[PDB]
Write an enzyme that holds these catalytic residues in place. Structure first.
Site, PDB file in Angstrom:
ATOM      1  N   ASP A 150       0.797  -1.257   0.000  1.00 37.30           N
ATOM      2  CA  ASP A 150       0.000   0.000   0.000  1.00 37.30           C
ATOM      3  C   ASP A 150       0.826   1.303   0.000  1.00 37.30           C
ATOM      4  O   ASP A 150       0.292   2.393   0.280  1.00 37.30           O
ATOM      5  CB  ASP A 150      -1.017  -0.020   1.139  1.00 37.30           C
ATOM      6  CG  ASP A 150      -0.389  -0.142   2.461  1.00 37.30           C
ATOM      7  OD1 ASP A 150       0.844   0.138   2.624  1.00 37.30           O
ATOM      8  OD2 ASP A 150      -1.144  -0.454   3.382  1.00 37.30           O
ATOM      9  N   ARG A 193       1.070   6.823   0.060  1.00 36.30           N
ATOM     10  CA  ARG A 193       0.310   5.852   0.862  1.00 36.30           C
ATOM     11  C   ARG A 193      -1.076   5.797   0.277  1.00 36.30           C
ATOM     12  O   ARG A 193      -1.750   6.844   0.083  1.00 36.30           O
ATOM     13  CB  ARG A 193       0.260   6.303   2.340  1.00 36.30           C
ATOM     14  CG  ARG A 193      -0.574   5.417   3.292  1.00 36.30           C
ATOM     15  CD  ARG A 193      -0.117   3.954   3.293  1.00 36.30           C
ATOM     16  NE  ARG A 193      -0.753   3.203   4.389  1.00 36.30           N
ATOM     17  CZ  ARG A 193      -1.945   2.625   4.326  1.00 36.30           C
ATOM     18  NH1 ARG A 193      -2.670   2.707   3.203  1.00 36.30           N
ATOM     19  NH2 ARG A 193      -2.416   1.961   5.388  1.00 36.30           N
ATOM     20  N   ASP A 223      -5.705  -1.027   3.738  1.00 39.94           N
ATOM     21  CA  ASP A 223      -4.578  -1.454   4.551  1.00 39.94           C
ATOM     22  C   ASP A 223      -4.218  -2.841   4.107  1.00 39.94           C
ATOM     23  O   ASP A 223      -5.027  -3.761   4.175  1.00 39.94           O
ATOM     24  CB  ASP A 223      -4.989  -1.472   6.017  1.00 39.94           C
ATOM     25  CG  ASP A 223      -3.827  -1.679   6.967  1.00 39.94           C
ATOM     26  OD1 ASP A 223      -2.682  -1.227   6.703  1.00 39.94           O
ATOM     27  OD2 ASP A 223      -4.098  -2.260   8.026  1.00 39.94           O
ATOM     28  N   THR A 224      -3.007  -2.961   3.617  1.00 39.99           N
ATOM     29  CA  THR A 224      -2.434  -4.251   3.271  1.00 39.99           C
ATOM     30  C   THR A 224      -1.676  -4.737   4.497  1.00 39.99           C
ATOM     31  O   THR A 224      -1.209  -3.936   5.302  1.00 39.99           O
ATOM     32  CB  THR A 224      -1.500  -4.132   2.036  1.00 39.99           C
ATOM     33  OG1 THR A 224      -0.614  -3.014   2.177  1.00 39.99           O
ATOM     34  CG2 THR A 224      -2.323  -3.885   0.775  1.00 39.99           C
ATOM     35  N   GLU A 244       1.525  -6.011   6.516  1.00 44.66           N
ATOM     36  CA  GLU A 244       2.914  -5.713   6.382  1.00 44.66           C
ATOM     37  C   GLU A 244       3.579  -6.925   5.751  1.00 44.66           C
ATOM     38  O   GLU A 244       3.062  -7.962   5.817  1.00 44.66           O
ATOM     39  CB  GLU A 244       3.544  -5.305   7.716  1.00 44.66           C
ATOM     40  CG  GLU A 244       2.845  -4.161   8.466  1.00 44.66           C
ATOM     41  CD  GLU A 244       3.009  -2.773   7.845  1.00 44.66           C
ATOM     42  OE1 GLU A 244       4.097  -2.478   7.374  1.00 44.66           O
ATOM     43  OE2 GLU A 244       2.023  -1.982   7.856  1.00 44.66           O
ATOM     44  N   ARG A 265       4.061  11.270   3.719  1.00 47.60           N
ATOM     45  CA  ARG A 265       3.641  10.456   2.576  1.00 47.60           C
ATOM     46  C   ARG A 265       2.462  11.065   1.872  1.00 47.60           C
ATOM     47  O   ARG A 265       1.553  11.578   2.505  1.00 47.60           O
ATOM     48  CB  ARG A 265       3.298   9.023   3.009  1.00 47.60           C
ATOM     49  CG  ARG A 265       4.445   8.282   3.743  1.00 47.60           C
ATOM     50  CD  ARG A 265       3.996   6.907   4.093  1.00 47.60           C
ATOM     51  NE  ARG A 265       2.845   7.008   5.000  1.00 47.60           N
ATOM     52  CZ  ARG A 265       2.266   5.980   5.609  1.00 47.60           C
ATOM     53  NH1 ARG A 265       2.748   4.734   5.478  1.00 47.60           N
ATOM     54  NH2 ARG A 265       1.217   6.200   6.379  1.00 47.60           N
TER      55      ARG A 265
HETATM   56  C1  LIG Z   1      -3.997   5.594   4.983  1.00 45.13           C
HETATM   57  C2  LIG Z   1      -3.702   6.687   5.985  1.00 45.13           C
HETATM   58  C3  LIG Z   1      -2.812   6.451   7.030  1.00 45.13           C
HETATM   59  N1  LIG Z   1      -2.552   7.427   7.950  1.00 45.13           N
HETATM   60  C4  LIG Z   1      -1.643   7.215   9.057  1.00 45.13           C
HETATM   61  C5  LIG Z   1      -2.483   6.671  10.215  1.00 45.13           C
HETATM   62  C6  LIG Z   1      -1.581   5.666  10.896  1.00 45.13           C
HETATM   63  O1  LIG Z   1      -0.903   6.258  12.044  1.00 45.13           O
HETATM   64  P1  LIG Z   1       0.120   5.380  12.943  1.00 45.13           P
HETATM   65  O2  LIG Z   1       1.476   5.268  12.314  1.00 45.13           O
HETATM   66  O3  LIG Z   1       0.207   6.307  14.135  1.00 45.13           O
HETATM   67  O4  LIG Z   1      -0.418   3.978  13.105  1.00 45.13           O
HETATM   68  C7  LIG Z   1      -0.568   5.250   9.824  1.00 45.13           C
HETATM   69  C8  LIG Z   1      -0.914   3.882   9.263  1.00 45.13           C
HETATM   70  O5  LIG Z   1      -0.313   3.727   7.973  1.00 45.13           O
HETATM   71  P2  LIG Z   1       0.439   2.330   7.632  1.00 45.13           P
HETATM   72  O6  LIG Z   1      -0.681   1.313   7.525  1.00 45.13           O
HETATM   73  O7  LIG Z   1       1.289   2.547   6.398  1.00 45.13           O
HETATM   74  O8  LIG Z   1       1.285   2.042   8.827  1.00 45.13           O
HETATM   75  O9  LIG Z   1      -0.628   6.219   8.787  1.00 45.13           O
HETATM   76  C9  LIG Z   1      -3.223   8.681   7.859  1.00 45.13           C
HETATM   77  O10 LIG Z   1      -2.996   9.591   8.707  1.00 45.13           O
HETATM   78  N2  LIG Z   1      -4.090   8.938   6.871  1.00 45.13           N
HETATM   79  C10 LIG Z   1      -4.373   8.013   5.931  1.00 45.13           C
HETATM   80  O11 LIG Z   1      -5.174   8.360   5.055  1.00 45.13           O
HETATM   81 CA   LIG Z   2      -0.090  -1.403   5.912  1.00 40.62          CA
END
Ligand SMILES: Cc1cn([C@H]2C[C@H](OP(=O)(O)O)[C@@H](COP(=O)(O)O)O2)c(=O)[nH]c1=O
Ligand SMILES: [Ca+2]
Length: 129
Positions: free
Chosen positions: A15, A29, A34-35, A37, A75
């Site tokens: 993702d 991103r 959510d994929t 890890e 991102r």
């Molecule tokens: C997809 C997405 C993720 N995020 C943030 C929330 C999550 O915070 P935390 O890092 O505090 O968990 C993190 C999860 O992305 P990942 O799934 O790449 O880890 O990225 C956003 O803020 N907005 C979004 O639209």
């Molecule tokens: Ca992920």
């Protein structure tokens, strides 16, 4: 929403992908998904799926939503398209992503993706198997 041009730099994981956008390298991103890890189950499958899709595309496009375009990690947040097919929707439809991270300001394709998830789930695909 509107689609904007970009070029692949490097596949990263299910993702996240590194694109050149308006001439600048940027990690994107994928919105609304959510994929797993890579170290989790279906993580390798999700990375391979997104990798093939972006690497095989002759045209990559970025479509931002109505809210914030960058997350707290820097991102870019977008829907990513590969020869016209939305990578975000494609991962969900295959049961390689869950619909996730649905935030108020950036939710345009929410019902589209949930429809795809219902069908992947119906079919017991991958994560739903
Ligand atoms: C997809 C997405 C993720 N995020 C943030 C929330 C999550 O915070 P935390 O890092 O505090 O968990 C993190 C999860 O992305 P990942 O799934 O790449 O880890 O990225 C956003 O803020 N907005 C979004 O639209
Ligand atoms: Ca992920």
């Amino acid at each position: 929403l509107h689609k904007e041009p970009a070029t692949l730099i490097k596949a990263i994981d299910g993702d996240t992908v590194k694109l050149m956008y308006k001439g600048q390298p940027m990690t994107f991103r994928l919105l609304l998904v959510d994929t797993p890890e890579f170290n989790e189950k279906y993580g390798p499958e999700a990375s391979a799926f997104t990798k093939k899709m972006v690497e095989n595309a002759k045209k990559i496009e970025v479509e931002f939503d109505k809210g914030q375009r960058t997350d707290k990690y820097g991102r870019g947040l977008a829907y990513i398209y590969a020869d016209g097919k939305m990578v975000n929707e494609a991962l969900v439809r295959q049961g390689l992503a869950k619909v996730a991270y649905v935030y108020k300001g950036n939710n345009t394709h929410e019902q589209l993706l949930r429809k795809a998830e219902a069908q992947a789930k119906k079919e017991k695909l991958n994560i739903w198997s």
